[PDB]
Design a protein around this ligand. Structure first.
Ligand SMILES: Nc1ncnc2c1ncn2[C@@H]1O[C@H](COP(=O)(O)OP(=O)(O)O)[C@@H](O)[C@H]1O
Ligand SMILES: Nc1ncnc2c1ncn2[C@@H]1O[C@H](COP(=O)(O)OP(=O)(O)O)[C@@H](O)[C@H]1O
Ligand SMILES: [Mg+2]
Ligand SMILES: [Mg+2]
Ligand SMILES: [Mg+2]
Ligand SMILES: [Mg+2]
Lengths: 293, 290
């Protein structure tokens, strides 16, 4: 079965969709639908866009409920929860600190860091869901929400839903470092995804890999760029949004604390760490269950 | 390639789990963990158990936020939204009307009276980083998650499989199923409805699995159209369960409009005089095996 691969730009990075058994006409039509949806998601979420739904909330000083879409509500909810579960390491309110670091020319003082830390905190954000509407609510006017670190994962999940709505049940889709697959590839086998150096089958799941994809990461506790020997983390989770959120959180925590969260939460994770000259690797038991022989 | 098949009781119905290739010690430990988790989900969601998390909320007359678990918040959020998207057909607040029909048939007057104690607009979910809440603006509101509890449990069982390093399985709770990977013959799990492969998806089939009435909230009466059966394939079994109930309540014509609009994978059976006829959405057909 011949596989069509579609590719384009979104959110400062790239997207891909591999779809077996679709003709040229259907391919062109789907590429248009895909790009249209991704552009919409970018318009929903981008901090690089002055007029995005999210930046409109960020510009607002209101402390009352601010209406948002179902997806916005869910992305924030997931981010808030995984934030708590990673001891605040994954923090969508860390924006003020990111800007402080030119995220780069001049290094901020601890005094400047402290001042900006006071404008952040996951405790300041609430999601309100009802049948016909939903809201974000902040209790700090200066709160700044940045969903950069989960936007690729959401986009990939949403691409998967689009495939389903289009009657496409076999696909591998990706946005930046986030991927989702379902069903069989061209050769009637579960989609294979290669990992930074092994191969996994993550059908029915999302996977996210650390790194910079747009054209960075700050420890919310210290208000400084991250350190540690953890050079790469890969998370497999039920959705790519979740995988993205865990991935960033774990990357911030570093090897020792990350493993503690991984163990407690029963996460499927693969880490590459640097030990002097060379590197060592670590996989949770849950991660190994996804490996293909 | 041998398949362990586990089975037990939960939520007034039965759960099932097919797992390829594991020894008896594993099968034994899993059964214990599965039953333990399903028991906890029942303690969370059951309208029978007077002391369930859900019944404690129902028992309260407070109109202020009531703390619940993440699962509870998410189940309710999904239920509220799919309720809206099925024009109120799927309605977790319909309990007062259900109880009314539990003696003698109520009049339309008695029905209209109880309608006043219902409405999806009365329920709010509040999510924060370290806690989350349900909130009702009507003390007498009664929440019943019977129609989604099976789907949630099947999804949660899938999460249990994953946390337990199991990559190939078919789990079911009542009419709700999830599957992943290859069965005891290297082929994707086959689900009889026509047969489908729904690996990586939830599926729910209409019907009674507990040991009652499905009420049309618009009329406040038992449903009485010619939609014999509806099956939904969705990203999760919770969603499938919720859609399935909504579309069953809506009946054939209205259900098809929702299915078209929302792009759902749905299979319907309707009664045409003496014979039946079938209908599949384009999306459902992508799951058919031959
Ligand atoms: N600790 C954090 N938690 C959540 N978001 C963060 C954190 N630190 C930085 N960010 C945001 O995430 C971005 C990095 O996102 P990522 O997708 O990993 O790389 P990039 O966006 O540079 O491709 C930063 O530019 C910043 O907007
Ligand atoms: N329209 C509705 N929306 C949501 N729940 C309903 C509705 N009508 C009835 N219910 C509740 O759902 C139950 C039916 O659930 P279901 O799983 O479809 O069948 P059963 O519980 O009989 O196996 C009823 O007993 C009642 O508690
Ligand atoms: Mg990136
Ligand atoms: Mg990320
Ligand atoms: Mg049932
Ligand atoms: Mg149902």
């Amino acid at each position: 079965t011949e596989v069509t691969v579609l590719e384009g730009k979104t959110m400062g990075t790239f997207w891909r969709a591999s779809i077996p058994g679709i003709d040229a006409k259907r391919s062109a039509e789907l590429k248009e639908k895909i790009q249209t949806q991704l552009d919409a998601d970018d318009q929903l979420l981008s901090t690089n866009k002055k007029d995005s739904a999210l930046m409109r909330f960020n510009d607002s000083q209101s402390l009352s409920p601010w209406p948002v879409s179902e997806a916005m509500a869910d992305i924030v909810t997931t981010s808030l929860r995984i934030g708590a579960k990673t001891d605040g390491a994954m923090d969508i309110t860390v924006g003020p600190l990111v800007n402080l670091w030119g995220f780069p020319v001049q290094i901020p003082s601890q005094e400047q860091i402290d001042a900006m830390k006071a404008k952040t905190g996951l405790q300041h954000l609430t999601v309100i869901n009802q049948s016909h509407q939903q809201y974000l609510q902040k209790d700090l006017p200066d709160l700044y929400v940045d969903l950069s670190t989960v936007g690729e994962g959401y986009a990939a999940d949403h691409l998967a839903r689009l495939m389903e709505q289009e009657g496409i049940s076999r696909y591998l889709v990706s946005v930046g470092g986030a991927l989702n697959s379902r069903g069989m590839n061209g050769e009637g086998l579960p989609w294979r995804v290669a990992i930074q150096k092994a191969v996994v089958d993550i059908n029915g799941h999302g996977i996210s890999t650390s790194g910079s994809y747009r054209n960075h990461v700050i420890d919310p506790q210290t208000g400084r760029p991250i350190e540690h020997n953890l050079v790469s983390v890969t998370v497999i989770a039920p959705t790519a949004l979740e995988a993205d959120a865990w991935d960033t959180g774990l990357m911030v925590l570093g090897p020792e604390k990350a493993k503690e969260v991984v163990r407690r939460e029963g996460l499927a994770v693969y880490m590459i760490t640097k030990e002097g000259d060379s590197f060592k690797t670590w996989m949770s038991p849950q991660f190994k269950s996804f490996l293909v022989s």
